[PDB]
Design an enzyme around this catalytic site. Structure first.
Site, PDB file in Angstrom:
ATOM      1  N   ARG A  28       0.842  -1.202   0.000  1.00  0.00           N
ATOM      2  CA  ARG A  28       0.000   0.000   0.000  1.00  0.00           C
ATOM      3  C   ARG A  28       0.875   1.250   0.000  1.00  0.00           C
ATOM      4  O   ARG A  28       0.553   2.288  -0.571  1.00  0.00           O
ATOM      5  CB  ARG A  28      -0.925  -0.026   1.221  1.00  0.00           C
ATOM      6  CG  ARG A  28      -2.193   0.789   0.935  1.00  0.00           C
ATOM      7  CD  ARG A  28      -3.012   0.906   2.226  1.00  0.00           C
ATOM      8  NE  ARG A  28      -4.444   0.830   2.005  1.00  0.00           N
ATOM      9  CZ  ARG A  28      -5.257   1.570   1.271  1.00  0.00           C
ATOM     10  NH1 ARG A  28      -4.811   2.597   0.554  1.00  0.00           N
ATOM     11  NH2 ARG A  28      -6.555   1.278   1.253  1.00  0.00           N
TER      12      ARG A  28
ATOM     13  N   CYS B  36      -0.855   8.312 -23.926  1.00  0.00           N
ATOM     14  CA  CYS B  36      -0.759   7.797 -25.276  1.00  0.00           C
ATOM     15  C   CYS B  36      -1.295   8.851 -26.248  1.00  0.00           C
ATOM     16  O   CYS B  36      -0.600   9.102 -27.262  1.00  0.00           O
ATOM     17  CB  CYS B  36      -1.554   6.491 -25.482  1.00  0.00           C
ATOM     18  SG  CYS B  36      -3.320   6.582 -25.191  1.00  0.00           S
ATOM     19  N   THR B  37      -2.420   9.480 -25.908  1.00  0.00           N
ATOM     20  CA  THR B  37      -2.921  10.467 -26.871  1.00  0.00           C
ATOM     21  C   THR B  37      -1.997  11.696 -26.988  1.00  0.00           C
ATOM     22  O   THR B  37      -1.772  12.281 -28.059  1.00  0.00           O
ATOM     23  CB  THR B  37      -4.344  10.951 -26.503  1.00  0.00           C
ATOM     24  OG1 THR B  37      -5.209   9.815 -26.278  1.00  0.00           O
ATOM     25  CG2 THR B  37      -4.774  11.813 -27.684  1.00  0.00           C
TER      26      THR B  37
ATOM     27  N   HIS C 239     -10.998   6.891 -30.304  1.00  0.00           N
ATOM     28  CA  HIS C 239     -10.211   5.910 -29.560  1.00  0.00           C
ATOM     29  C   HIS C 239     -10.831   4.561 -29.234  1.00  0.00           C
ATOM     30  O   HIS C 239     -12.003   4.427 -28.857  1.00  0.00           O
ATOM     31  CB  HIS C 239     -10.020   6.586 -28.190  1.00  0.00           C
ATOM     32  CG  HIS C 239      -8.844   6.234 -27.389  1.00  0.00           C
ATOM     33  ND1 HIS C 239      -8.787   5.020 -26.725  1.00  0.00           N
ATOM     34  CD2 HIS C 239      -7.688   6.867 -27.110  1.00  0.00           C
ATOM     35  CE1 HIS C 239      -7.629   4.916 -26.061  1.00  0.00           C
ATOM     36  NE2 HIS C 239      -6.977   6.031 -26.267  1.00  0.00           N
TER      37      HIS C 239
ATOM     38  N   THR D 114     -11.154  15.280 -22.567  1.00  0.00           N
ATOM     39  CA  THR D 114      -9.814  14.668 -22.392  1.00  0.00           C
ATOM     40  C   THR D 114      -8.787  15.765 -22.184  1.00  0.00           C
ATOM     41  O   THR D 114      -8.896  16.842 -22.768  1.00  0.00           O
ATOM     42  CB  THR D 114      -9.349  13.697 -23.477  1.00  0.00           C
ATOM     43  OG1 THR D 114      -7.998  13.326 -23.162  1.00  0.00           O
ATOM     44  CG2 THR D 114      -9.286  14.350 -24.858  1.00  0.00           C
TER      45      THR D 114
ATOM     46  N   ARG E 277     -15.036   7.308 -27.802  1.00  0.00           N
ATOM     47  CA  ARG E 277     -14.614   5.939 -27.548  1.00  0.00           C
ATOM     48  C   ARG E 277     -15.406   5.016 -28.430  1.00  0.00           C
ATOM     49  O   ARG E 277     -16.642   5.142 -28.371  1.00  0.00           O
ATOM     50  CB  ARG E 277     -14.803   5.556 -26.082  1.00  0.00           C
ATOM     51  CG  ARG E 277     -14.140   6.382 -25.044  1.00  0.00           C
ATOM     52  CD  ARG E 277     -14.875   7.535 -24.355  1.00  0.00           C
ATOM     53  NE  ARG E 277     -14.856   7.443 -22.922  1.00  0.00           N
ATOM     54  CZ  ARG E 277     -15.307   7.736 -21.734  1.00  0.00           C
ATOM     55  NH1 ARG E 277     -16.353   8.524 -21.429  1.00  0.00           N
ATOM     56  NH2 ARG E 277     -14.665   7.205 -20.699  1.00  0.00           N
TER      57      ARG E 277
END
Ligand SMILES: C=CC(C)(C)c1cc2cc3c(cc2oc1=O)O[C@H](C(C)(C)O)C3
Lengths: 359, 359, 359, 359
Positions: free
Chosen positions: C92, C166-167, C194, C226, C249
């Site tokens: 944790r 990634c974008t 995406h 986004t 999406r």
């Protein structure tokens, strides 16, 4: 000049048989693909279709196009790894193709139009010696399934042959081992859970002969009768009358699975059946039947070139505790790829046996 | 009441124009559909196609099939909610249809083969008076778009007309309001995220004139050029040349979205644009331009019959803070449903108008 | 001396980083992956997950499992072509991780639970020296994008960094080229179409912090806000406040596409932008920005290692003729794959800069 | 006299149970749904979840929300057809739930967390008198299948009961007619082709209990073991140990199919089994078992409220000619919808028996 092959029809079926042979290292060295015939003559479009496959990946050989003679209006020759393959326009009658002129002895009949044996005979009339239909056939025409009955091939009785269907190449090997190892099959019903195919439709459309078959393939489970299980009676004659089945077509791009339920002819256990499938896969069925004991899903069989890949864990876990006769066998297949490799396999066996008939 | 309509093309857009005509409640009353023409006569299959729709649910009118002739064969007459519709076969040339015999003035041309005005003229030569092409037409032909320029229809000048495309019917209403509200449109580029259609393929197929378009439809994002934004320039002449776009075909069954980016002619805000879209939707574009301020996904627009459904949340949350010229507007459309209604909508239009040019 | 790496989180992105590394032949030469930490301890599960990938195919290297010591019940060690990788149980508190105990200096943090700079600093108390966060970070972690601003990495100041998203990695290289070459970016709005991701849901489920995002992923087009385009403002300071975007999406399993619309700071043409992007991909963006001029669909980018793959035919065909300012640029990315190769690249960059910073 | 219901868990299955009740016109009339219990208490989000359904369409009742008291920042009460439903906060322990306070007599336990009979008995400590678990239960909870053994409900002994699974509810009615009509079952193997569910993943994720089950669901065929067929043994004790089965999870969002293969206890034929199935469905199985003889696909069963819909043509066309013992039966089920109405049917039946008991 090795085996002289011609491919009639260069749609997805012909295309995947060509690439299956490139994959087994046969191009220009064991098989000469002399020509390919289609209604399309755009060679650049063919080259493109050959380079990119949404499910199989990227062709591993370079594909360029050229001209057979400087006269020609536009590229008519595909160049694959150095090998020149000519594109010819499709004829209504196979007897018109220039097989003879080209020196082709074996024709892979993939158009889907010349499935009757006498229609398929036209290729021999055009100069060819043998035809392998890449689908089930009618009019007689020896049906041959590699690793099951392919030694029944008799070089001058069988000129025009059927390599069966992709579902029958998956099921036949399972039934063949069940019979050959002594379990036998008294009765059996087969359900194939099937990826969509090109005869299906993106949105609900018109399919007069198959009403369910015309509905939207990517959002439905679509039942269909099928002849694959009854077709196993041609290749394993003792099963005629004892086996039939159905398909359910589901929204996956490729890879299918056979769910076989059957009653054995002697007392046995799913464990002995499971040991025999594995033993067979490593020996007399090698390259045709494999098995997995891992937790696989359909994507994991993509590009598998076996005809039938037994799912040991799915089979051992979902059978009846101590059952002696009534069993379920699960086996997968890359419905497009294993079949294509089997078409090439069958062509080579025939050639091998034909050459032997001249020795 | 009267108003005699005949649908040519009983494929998916014809039955959807037909069902769009029934749902609201016009079959036999204000509109009487008399015959449908198609390359198949099976009337029983037609009723099965009408009864079950994977995306739109089940037709809520009962449909049956009786005979019309002793001596030809099976049935040929649909009976929807007490009304008889006859199925005639198709012929290579449109001037063979018995429109006069049957007494049909208005023909809903939906087969996709007679988009060139002259071919559409053929129905005129067959006894019909007016024609609505249910696709983008050519050869010259008044392109009308309900809610935008439909009221330009001239009963004496316009006999053959085109209702544009479902994409143009989603874009032109938003653009109409931007121009009519004085926001102006200096320049614009549209992107439509479009569900797959029937001209698409389940697996990698053959698609000569659109290599990308031939690829497997339900596992790919497939880019395409589209003429829907250029078509807005024919319907809203002040945008002529200032607009264009493309399409991305994605794996959903139905429902598409327009993603329009544009530069306004003068200083504004997205909030003023947003208010103006909402205000026109409740007024002068009511029934054609709807909006939502909820968290909707494309399944939520299935069966919405507006032409264009502006997503207020998606537009307001995704624009640049404080910007005065550069904006993104998002609008949805059930590409199948809305358009279907617009065809029937147009048809009435003209009925209401061209009567009063004959009367 | 191989740099000692630890991977916190051996879920999808951690695995794909690992796969990216093996493929480039870095494992055991430039990088020693000493340990992977995760909630699961099952090495045989890890090996299964590494072997089979529904989108990227079968891992081409052999994966086996072992025990660190004979005591240990189940396998706790992954073995890849002889390289041994300890599977350690998550904690944790990242400060209790045994990085120092393992000689790990570089942690790739990919659980998504320690994206705040202050939380990821717990790895340093655990013994690491540097942390690369494989997602957008918070709390002031330096954001670095390979090929764009990665030379801003400063060894004595930047200990916990972010590799962006990634974008952001697809978008940023496009904007960099535009800004670097002097085309400039006045305003821009991005749309990403995406592939769904692990955060999404199979059927309509619970998602109180993104209502749309909880709806069924493989049958809907799902809009979302986004921060990717705004994040470009942090890597390319002159674009701050000039760019924003959204996402849609769609139901494809992998591979995404950026649909950028922008106003350039000087008069240009699409031809000129297209030429710059191709030149840049061949030179200073080499390995980062690729291009295609072929007829590709999303599946054709699966396993493309670039961050961004400019679509020249889609860009050149869908823009306004003679336009000088308002443009659309289309570029692809294998959302998973290019980004994981960049994580690896950032780590190597960082290790070289740290080596140079000490002597 | 309305009965007092509470729903533990207002995730999808709880929501679909409440929607089914509403659809049956029971809300406020026969049943007072007093409250729903979940970790979310944002009444606006539940309203949004209920109003829109990707698979089942828009709720046919209007849903609005209110506050239990003026202070209630975020609304906490759902309102359908003026019936008020309080949204209460989920508890770690069912015994701490306020059912006595609220006056709830029947609890529909749908979280999936309290399937152990003694965990669901906590509701009893909370003040409830009866618990229906909307899943298979463990620990001796009496399993009741409507139309098969529900008259085995015993008010004085059965306090925490199970409504079994959606799969068991589809199969049990089929086995129930075979047994009740004297065909009998010697041995049976079932395969269910099931729609993906909320336990699956969008992309390959983590699933330590079900390795296959963690693989990307919408692009795979995913085998899975299942307890449904064996559970048929608790409801029809004569089949104990004679039945088992498996599932293949396919990428359709809803609607599944049971493919049952069995050997009858005496000679019969597929035509007599078909007639018995059809006859039971019009009589003692009415509302539980339906049948079709139409060419239906999975989307045609969406919103069907039967538990099992026998497919007469798929059955009659896919069995072995002249077979007397070894048969296949095909039956469909909307896995969500049928089962949800059965959960409500079971509570109303328990309420009638507990009502009758007290007399
Ligand atoms: C969905 C509704 C309607 C109007 C019927 C419609 C038809 C339609 C037809 C084609 C298309 C895009 C389309 O979009 C639409 O909205 O691209 C295709 C090619 C031909 C490849 O360019 C053919």
């Amino acid at each position: 000049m090795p085996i002289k092959v011609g491919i009639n029809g260069f749609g997805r079926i012909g295309r995947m048989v060509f690439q299956a042979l490139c994959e087994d290292g046969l191009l220009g060295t064991e098989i000469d693909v002399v020509a390919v015939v289609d209604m399309n003559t755009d060679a650049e479009y063919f080259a493109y279709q050959m380079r990119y496959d949404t499910v199989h990946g990227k062709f591993k050989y370079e594909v360029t196009t050229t001209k057979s003679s400087p006269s020609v209006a536009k590229d008519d020759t595909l160049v694959v790894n150095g090998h020149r393959i000519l594109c010819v326009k499709a004829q209504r009658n196979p007897a018109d193709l220039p097989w003879g002129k080209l020196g082709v002895e074996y024709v892979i009949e993939s158009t889907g139009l010349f499935t009757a044996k006498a229609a398929a005979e036209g290729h021999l009339r055009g100069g060819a010696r043998k035809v392998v239909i890449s689908a089930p056939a009618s009019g007689g025409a020896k049906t041959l399934v590699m690793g099951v009955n392919h030694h029944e091939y008799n070089p001058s009785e069988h000129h025009v042959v059927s390599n069966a269907s992709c579902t029958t190449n998956c099921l036949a090997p399972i039934v063949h081992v069940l019979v050959k190892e002594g379990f036998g099959v008294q009765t059996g019903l087969m359900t194939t859970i099937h990826s969509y195919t090109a005869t299906q439709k993106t949105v609900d459309g018109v399919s007069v002969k198959d009403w369910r078959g015309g509905r939207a393939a990517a959002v439905n489970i679509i039942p269909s009768t099928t002849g694959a299980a009854k077709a196993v009676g041609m290749v394993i004659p003792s099963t005629q009358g004892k086996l039939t089945g159905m398909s359910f077509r589901v929204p996956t791009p490729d890879v299918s699975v056979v769910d076989l339920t059957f009653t054995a002819a002697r007392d046995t256990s799913i464990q002995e059946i499971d040991a025999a499938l594995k033993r067979a896969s490593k020996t007399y069925m090698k390259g045709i039947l494999g098995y997995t004991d891992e937790e696989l899903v359909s994507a994991d069989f993509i590009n598998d070139n076996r005809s039938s890949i037994y799912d040991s864990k799915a089979t051992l876990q979902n059978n009846l505790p101590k059952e002696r006769r009534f069993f379920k066998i699960v086996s997968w297949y890359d419905n497009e790829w294993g079949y294509s490799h089997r078409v090439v396999d069958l062509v080579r066996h025939m050639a091998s046996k034909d050459r032997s008939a001249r020795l």
